[PDB]
Design a protein around this ligand. Structure first.
Ligand SMILES: Clc1ccc(-c2cnco2)cn1
Length: 209
């Protein structure tokens, strides 16, 4: 059973700007998604300080980067707090309407796309490199769900029958044909070292057969 939703107009406009603006510094998508994972891990860690049972769904707090050249996907997995169905529908747990308003003002006031994370909407930088994004998520208080969008003004949500996750979020980037450098080990390592060197969780770059 698949539910299809329209993006709020302001979010559709944000996505269109990300997809259509000429902007060469696309590699920041990875910094933004790793930062979101770190924020999600901080949240479950904080809850666990007063309620250790919050980690019954998984004690390890980490980030995995999983390239797959056969599927043309880069997957960012974290064991953070995850998202409820309501969070997914409400712009993946962001205040994206107000964040977009500020971001678009800043761009007209001199800012560039790399600054997107200062406005709480860094997730959408995935569309710098991905033609489709799938988000699989499991929060302690809800079931496992899959969100997906190829932009174009709509997203879907369905219960996920795939591999159970325990707790956290998996962002699957279905890369554009001309963006496959982001599956190359040396390129990913370079981006992590440049932009994510102070993230306080282990970031494991998986290798391929
Ligand atoms: Cl990641 C990103 C890329 C482009 C823009 C933008 C806004 N206005 C023109 O381009 C914002 N964020």
């Amino acid at each position: 059973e698949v539910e299809t939703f329209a993006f709020q107009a302001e979010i559709a406009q944000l996505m269109s700007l990300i997809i259509n603006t000429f902007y060469s510094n696309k590699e920041i998508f990875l910094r933004e998604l790793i930062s979101n994972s770190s924020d999600a891990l901080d949240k479950i860690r904080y809850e666990s300080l007063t309620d250790p049972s919050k980690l019954d769904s998984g004690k390890e707090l980490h980030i995995n980067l999983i390239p797959n050249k056969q599927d043309r996907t880069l997957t960012i997995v974290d064991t953070g707090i995850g998202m409820t169905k309501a969070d997914l529908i409400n712009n993946l747990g962001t205040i994206a309407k107000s964040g977009t308003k500020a971001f678009m003002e800043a761009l007209q006031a001199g800012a560039d796309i790399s600054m997107i994370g200062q406005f709480g909407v860094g997730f959408y930088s995935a569309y710098l490199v991905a033609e489709k994004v799938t988000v699989i998520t499991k929060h302690n208080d809800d079931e496992q769900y899959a969100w997906e969008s190829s932009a174009g003004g709509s997203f879907t949500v369905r219960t996920d029958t795939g591999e159970p996750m325990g707790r956290g979020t998996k962002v699957i980037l279905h890369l554009k044909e001309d963006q496959t450098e982001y599956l190359e080990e040396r390129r990913i390592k370079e981006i992590v070292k440049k932009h994510s060197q102070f993230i306080g969780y282990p970031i494991t770059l998986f290798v391929e057969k």
